[PDB]
């Protein structure tokens, strides 16, 4: 039968996506749609998986199309849980696409339905999504409405943190703490940003999540710069560098060096500034990062000019004019 082949194809789609082969898995889900099935419930789950797979492949236009089909079918068959899920997914896709007004409505529907159904897990997830949308909306612009969007994000993240604490969901706390800390940073609440990123750091360590650990050090560094605590900030960027190398991440290593360069400039230790800027210059060429190469040149020109070396300043400015043209 069609229904049996459809399920077989869908199972393989799910296997391949879980194994991290979204490209191959998409084709199986699309084969499954091609064969077809009378079970609209099954079809709905295939659309939703296509939507997510295309989302992770960064084809957001396609993700939206498939989540909208899923949302519609969820209404057709009166699957309220499925409707809630499809709405959250559509809202998240709209957020990435920069369509924040509609994203808010969809994410709000995921929440409202989750409450109606007394689904605490879904409710929590929807509050995180909403925090994210309001954060992106505020950041995309403070005018009062912008401050209000960011403050609503804070509130949504705090509400989430409250529920996921009851649920014992540590990975969810990790996500909320990190985005809450970034929202505090945008609002100028720099002490609160540190507190949030400290919790995020702790959770990253608990999971052995090296990239989350590295994000948190880096975000902590940024908050301490705006607190005027430049020495402490350099210390955190030292931790990110050490982690960058460990992880053998070339780009991330280059950022840390740049960040340290700027931080010593604020401390007025121009020799160290030069040192790290050179290391950034080096890795930027390697990765084919032309934009980075120019920035290094400009930074180095300013450091050599403040240090006293009026020859190398001119040389790097000379190199800055080249890159800028090229």
């Amino acid at each position: 039968s069609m229904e049996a082949s459809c399920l077989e194809l869908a199972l393989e789609g799910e296997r391949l996506c879980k194994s991290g082969d979204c490209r191959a898995g998409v084709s199986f889900f699309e084969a499954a749609v091609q064969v077809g099935t009378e079970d609209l419930k099954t079809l709905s789950a295939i659309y939703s998986q296509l939507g997510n797979a295309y989302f992770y492949l960064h084809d957001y236009a396609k993700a939206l199309e498939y989540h909208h089909h899923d949302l519609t079918l969820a209404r057709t068959i009166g699957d309220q849980l499925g409707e809630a899920k499809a709405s959250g997914n559509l809202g998240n896709t709209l957020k990435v696409l920069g369509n924040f007004d509609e994203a808010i409505v969809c994410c709000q529907r995921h929440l409202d339905i989750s409450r109606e159904l007394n689904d605490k897990v879904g409710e929590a997830r929807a509050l995180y999504n909403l925090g994210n949308v309001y954060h992106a909306k505020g950041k995309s612009f403070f005018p009062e409405e912008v401050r209000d969007a960011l403050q609503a994000a804070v509130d949504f993240y705090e509400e989430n943190l409250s529920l996921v604490t009851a649920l014992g969901d540590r990975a969810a706390q990790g996500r909320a703490f990190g985005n809450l800390g970034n929202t505090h940073y945008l609002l100028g609440n720099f002490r609160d940003a540190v507190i949030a990123h400290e919790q995020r750091l702790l959770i990253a360590k608990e999971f052995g999540d090296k990239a989350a650990e590295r994000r948190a050090y880096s975000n902590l560094g940024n908050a301490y710069i705006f607190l005027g605590e430049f020495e402490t900030a350099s210390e955190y960027y030292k931790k990110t560098l050490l982690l960058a190398r460990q992880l053998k991440d070339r780009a991330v290593e280059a950022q840390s060096c740049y960040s340290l360069g700027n931080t010593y400039t604020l401390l007025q230790d121009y020799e160290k500034a030069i040192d790290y800027h050179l290391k950034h210059l080096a890795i930027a060429q390697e990765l084919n990062d032309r934009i980075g190469e120019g920035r290094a040149c400009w930074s180095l020109g300013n450091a050599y000019t403040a240090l006293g070396n009026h020859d190398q300043a001119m040389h790097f400015a000379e190199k800055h004019l080249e890159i800028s043209r090229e």
Binding site: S44, A45, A84, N92, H110, N129, G181, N182, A212, I225
Partner: peptide, 19 residues
Amino acid sequence: DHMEMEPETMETKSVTDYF
């Protein structure tokens, strides 16, 4: 200084939900 964000979650469905 760009703040680095945490990943989006997505909600997931499976054809096996109904086995």
